[PDB]
Point group: D5
Chain length 173, copies 10
Amino acid sequence: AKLNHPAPEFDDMALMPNGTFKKVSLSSYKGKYVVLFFYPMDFTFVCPTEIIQFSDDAKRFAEINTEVISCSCDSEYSHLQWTSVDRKKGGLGPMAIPMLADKTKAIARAYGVLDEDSGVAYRGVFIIDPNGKLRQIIINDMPIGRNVEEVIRLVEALQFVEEHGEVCPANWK
Amino acid sequence: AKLNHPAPEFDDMALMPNGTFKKVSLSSYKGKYVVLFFYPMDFTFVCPTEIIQFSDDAKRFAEINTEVISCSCDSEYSHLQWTSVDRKKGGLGPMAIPMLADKTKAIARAYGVLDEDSGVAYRGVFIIDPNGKLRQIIINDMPIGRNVEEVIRLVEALQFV
Amino acid sequence: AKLNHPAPEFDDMALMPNGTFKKVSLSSYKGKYVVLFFYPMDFTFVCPTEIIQFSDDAKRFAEINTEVISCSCDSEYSHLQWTSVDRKKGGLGPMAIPMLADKTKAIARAYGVLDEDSGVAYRGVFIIDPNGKLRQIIINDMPIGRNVEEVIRLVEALQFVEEHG
Amino acid sequence: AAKLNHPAPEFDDMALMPNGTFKKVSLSSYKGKYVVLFFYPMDFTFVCPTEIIQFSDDAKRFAEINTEVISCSCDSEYSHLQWTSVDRKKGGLGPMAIPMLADKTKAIARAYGVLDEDSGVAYRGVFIIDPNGKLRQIIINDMPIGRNVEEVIRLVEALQFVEEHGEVC
Amino acid sequence: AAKLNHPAPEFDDMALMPNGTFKKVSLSSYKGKYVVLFFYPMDFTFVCPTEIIQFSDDAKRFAEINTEVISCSCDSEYSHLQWTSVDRKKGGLGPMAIPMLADKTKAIARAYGVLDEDSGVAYRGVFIIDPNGKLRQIIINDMPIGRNVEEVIRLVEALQFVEEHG
Amino acid sequence: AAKLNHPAPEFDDMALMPNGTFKKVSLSSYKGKYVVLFFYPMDFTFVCPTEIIQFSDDAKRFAEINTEVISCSCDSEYSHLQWTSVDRKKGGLGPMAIPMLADKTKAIARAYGVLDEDSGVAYRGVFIIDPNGKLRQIIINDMPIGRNVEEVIRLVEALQFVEEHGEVCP
Amino acid sequence: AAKLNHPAPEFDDMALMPNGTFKKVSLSSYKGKYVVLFFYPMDFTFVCPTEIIQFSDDAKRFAEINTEVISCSCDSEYSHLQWTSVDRKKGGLGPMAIPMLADKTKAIARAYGVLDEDSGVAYRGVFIIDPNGKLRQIIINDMPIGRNVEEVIRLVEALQFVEEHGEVCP
Amino acid sequence: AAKLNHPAPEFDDMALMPNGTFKKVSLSSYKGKYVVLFFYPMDFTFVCPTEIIQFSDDAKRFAEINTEVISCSCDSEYSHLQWTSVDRKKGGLGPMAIPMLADKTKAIARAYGVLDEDSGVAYRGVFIIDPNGKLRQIIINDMPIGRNVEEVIRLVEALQFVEEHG
Amino acid sequence: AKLNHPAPEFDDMALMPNGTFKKVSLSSYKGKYVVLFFYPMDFTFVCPTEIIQFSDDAKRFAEINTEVISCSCDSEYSHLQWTSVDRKKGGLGPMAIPMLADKTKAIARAYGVLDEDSGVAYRGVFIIDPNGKLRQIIINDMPIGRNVEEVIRLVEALQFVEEHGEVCPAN
Amino acid sequence: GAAKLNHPAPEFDDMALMPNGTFKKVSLSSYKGKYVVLFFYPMDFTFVCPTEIIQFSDDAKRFAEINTEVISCSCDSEYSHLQWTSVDRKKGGLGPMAIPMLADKTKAIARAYGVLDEDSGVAYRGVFIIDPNGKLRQIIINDMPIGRNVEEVIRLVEALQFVEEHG
Ligand SMILES: [Cl-]
Ligand SMILES: [Cl-]
Ligand SMILES: [Cl-]
Ligand SMILES: [Cl-]
Ligand SMILES: [Cl-]
Ligand SMILES: [Cl-]
Ligand SMILES: [Cl-]
Ligand SMILES: [Cl-]
Ligand SMILES: [Cl-]
Ligand SMILES: [Cl-]
């Protein structure tokens, strides 16, 4: 998993937005920016605010040619049980984001986000560009939530450089 | 995982009967017969049953110096979400059996029950004696339920000797 | 010896039902369900029963497209001699089941049923489906008999999922 | 390389102190405080500063929260100095409140897996080491994408929060 | 398989004693007497119990000359018994005066290089170990060729002659 | 090693023919007849002819039953000759009806696992190869224990018996 | 690694051209002229670029004799520039007539075996490559010992002398 | 390898002393003074003594500055002598004030990486070892390019300067 | 088998001068010069003249502190048998030299005189000095006889270099 | 080094100081057709032992008469050989030789014939006889202080030829 090197190919089951079970692959997205992010387990004893925040800003992301997708070492079936429970009662409720499920752990390992000791992933976030290359690495510890707006900043930031020929200094725009 | 050889030691999180999260080890049971059995996934579409049958006959088992315990590659959490949901609505409802969760897959592998290709365990059932030795191996395919009464027969049968 | 993976091919001498000595192979059964089961030694001091039960329910099994066959690390000749003694006097008497004899131990090892230390097999039972794939593993300790009815349950159970689902 | 929740890779090498001295700094020196190690490619880069500076400035604000920060690049201690002498106003860097590591050896960049073996310089990497000396945050930005110092802070504060809550007896 | 004038391969396994007991016999047990170890393929044979018996009979004659004899095959101690129960008259074996080794393990056959890895049984092998525990005679007959027990004796006497005078 | 029912180890080396020539003999030459290969330690031993001779004599009797015999030792073809020149009466060997192999190389002794690496000579080994070139009998006597030629015959006849009908076991 | 009379190690990396451009220079570019490659530790030193400069100055004199010269150090192309902007009068370097290689990779220093793995910088090395691209002179001074540019010339001239005729002395 | 600022490769071999003796010289013997070791291809080469000689002459001048010099080639101690006997005037070498190493073994040439494995002779190498026995200067001239002894001196003086002061 | 290095130790059966069978070792000779020489086979068709020449000059050798001994890959018994035949009838007759017999071939190999292909040794001749070191190697092809006088010359020559410090050049 | 008997002798190809005064690279294959006598000596201006070297040079004629060519070899330079050939035999020199003098500065040859004393770096008094077919047929290695007997070398060559001619 190096930068400016084709991101690790992932191909596995995912709980589509609606309710289908489709096998998703990173090559599917060849053409758009992709935001892959990981989370430890599913039926978390806290506020799925993090996972959700992405699902919500999903629209806002799509607006900027970027698709996002989650991932964890839980079963496609486990995802749904969680998507069935109402967001109001500690559930997750319908997501606008596909939810990867690598029961194999092959993906977590590929991105070096897996904690071999526990068997779950860290709060990782990667941004793959339209050409299929990895261009951003971020790995938060297990209790530290992420800032979705930042992810966006970064994406926009990346696109800026693709559009024009200059770079982006500290705290951009 | 050989017969008449100390069963593979397992030590991992388990959803106790009540609702606690306790790390259970096979050595904890040193003194009683143990019945370890595996199942693929948790919120299995259409398939619950089997797991329950064990939880119920749990009493009947305890009666004969044997404790039973489940196991699957699902999280202590994703599964709980399954002890509270009502048995009536495809749920599982309170279990009298501790439910092992090896997110690590270390246990499934140890008993050679893991399907490396899918990442889940087959319907395996093992019987460890009071001295901590493995004395019975049974591995059913993914769609073939087990007969709990038989497991008992076997345990009683073992004790007879 | 993994599940849903083509069962280990066995090809060795077997004491046919009648009295002939024929070399049997697992591929011969390609088309029917097969029940392979092992037992330690031949004459022993109380180990009839189990072996027989299979031979008897043999008919009942055949009724459900399944053939059964035994196996142990004893010679084809030792099998015969045991089949000659009358069931009534601790013997075995005519079997409706072919009796494999792997003097080589190649089979016991293939199914991971051999106790390398003693040189004999554990009470193992496997069910191969018509496509030649292993679909059930059962290994009982040396002193624990098996329940043939259960084996059937399992076979029927397997077939059920074949038709439906 | 470096894993999370595992003692961060020890670094021990020359650094251009805030004032103007040349002192060999080590990660163990900071055992007790949170540390923010961040990398940048080269030194007299037309627009690599800005980012570098922001840290130097928020240095005070960081110190306020028990965290010390330090830069690093594959340039010479002397090259750092020279860059520090030029006035911030004329594309320079001007006095920093941050020590500036210089691993001419590239040993550090490699240790944190931030080195681009092909070019020989480091990517915009940022790591947060806790007071116990363990790595707890990884961030690697591409060569043209600046970082958001405020976020680093958020993260540090965030980490500390979790420390305070849930504990001893 | 084994070398001459070199301590014979140690064997330690179950054997169907003369009477009817099941005792674990070892080659070291015989340290002091000459030993005749001989192998045979399978147990409930066809026409070859002859050979096995001849030894059992000349067992007395052998003992007379400080030599003990013992058989061996890859069949179970229980299979040996069952064969010893059938009356010699009806193709059986009947009571033997010789212990009958049973290496279900095949460890012995291999040690003497008498095992046919392909079939899993031993060839008609015969070895003579001296009182000091050293191998001093090797003989391996094909599967269908019987042995001449008198010869084995000749050999033993022959060996003793040499140790005697010199 | 080489084993039973497996093509016997091919040997190809100098031998002191019956008459007095020096010919290189090979086991394949005999493809068609039974062969009896037997070894002996050294040549001018103070008591090793007895045995060697017996074979030479029963050579005729053997030939009668489609079997050829041949000796072998780690001595030189020339050493064999010498020994053959001395009259049997004076501890010699006298003309043999059997070819006498000489593997100065020791390649043969090793091939049949009859060589005592420590001393460099062979043990009293005797092997019977069938007409198809397969080894069917192994016998290795210690250095001081003579062999019984009649037995070798018994065994050959015995083998042939089974090649015609079912099987023997006297 | 680098041997004499063997094609010099190929170098291909960024260099701060005389004027002010950033061009990737390669040793093959010079195929045809004699080249003088010389190393120096670091860029902004408390020393006097005298050594580095002397080359830049005699650059003309060198060119006069079909030889091009080029520096190299493990500092960034940007660092070179910065050092080139400072006026020679104030401890700077000032415009150079020589391209200044920058191997941030250290690949070059290693190739010529001038790198001090421990510190990460190069020793005062000087090599002379001939028009055919072969290495013909090795010189490695310690870190504090300056070089004598005139000598480098002597050597070049000396080498050329042999090219036309057939042998030289001191 | 022979690296800078690392103890120079120890050399210990026969050398034709100034006078005419054959003594085995070692680099440790010089521990205390600066040493100038220099190599040359072969011995009786029609042209290119000159170089070797220049050193012998400036030997005095060198000694004046705490430095001893010594030559080396893959030729025999005897071959050196024979060359020293011929009068400098007739293409000879004549008495040298410098010990002349002879590594018939080639061990030395290799140690300093001056050997041309293909031909079997050394290149015009010159190394300066400091009083602590460390290598501080490397110079390797091609086979046809003479060296400038004055420079070697410059370098030595130069080295000493940095030592004194600093 | 290098020069000026302790000769390869040999320890094996040898047909003593008289008629005994004694196991001889090179260390036994520690103190005298030893001449070890090999020959292919025993009862060859060609005249043993070479082997014999040594046995005869044995006396002359002994006179100069040197003992000589033969060796071949033939059995001690075979040597015996060859020694009984009268020299006159192509035999060898009593030897004044011990005759080594390495049925093992270990010696021949040790001195690099064995022709692995045939199994016999080449006409090799080695001279070991009193300190047990090898000081002369000579290996003649199978059909080329040796010149015993030369072996002597060499021994004397070696000894000369011992008494005096000077060297014994061409002759 | 491997130099077995009845096996093609180790090929040598290296500078040699020809009889006259030229420097020519000689090879063992050049002699394919004649018998060759290769012999080694330690060093060149050796305090003594040229006598040995010379004897060969002289009997060179006598050797040639019997289809055999001889050639020396040592680890000294071609130039060193020359310089030794210039000094008059009368004053401890060598004087014009009728034999080519190999010079293996590389030591490749000494090693090939297993005549090199790795410790000192020079060769032992070795002498080998190669037959016209290029096979080695005689090995002789004398210690450093023991001179050789050229007549014997001849005896051997003649001896070899005899066996060739006959059978
Ligand atoms: Cl990277
Ligand atoms: Cl098992
Ligand atoms: Cl499995
Ligand atoms: Cl990690
Ligand atoms: Cl043996
Ligand atoms: Cl066998
Ligand atoms: Cl070089
Ligand atoms: Cl260096
Ligand atoms: Cl040598
Ligand atoms: Cl040889």
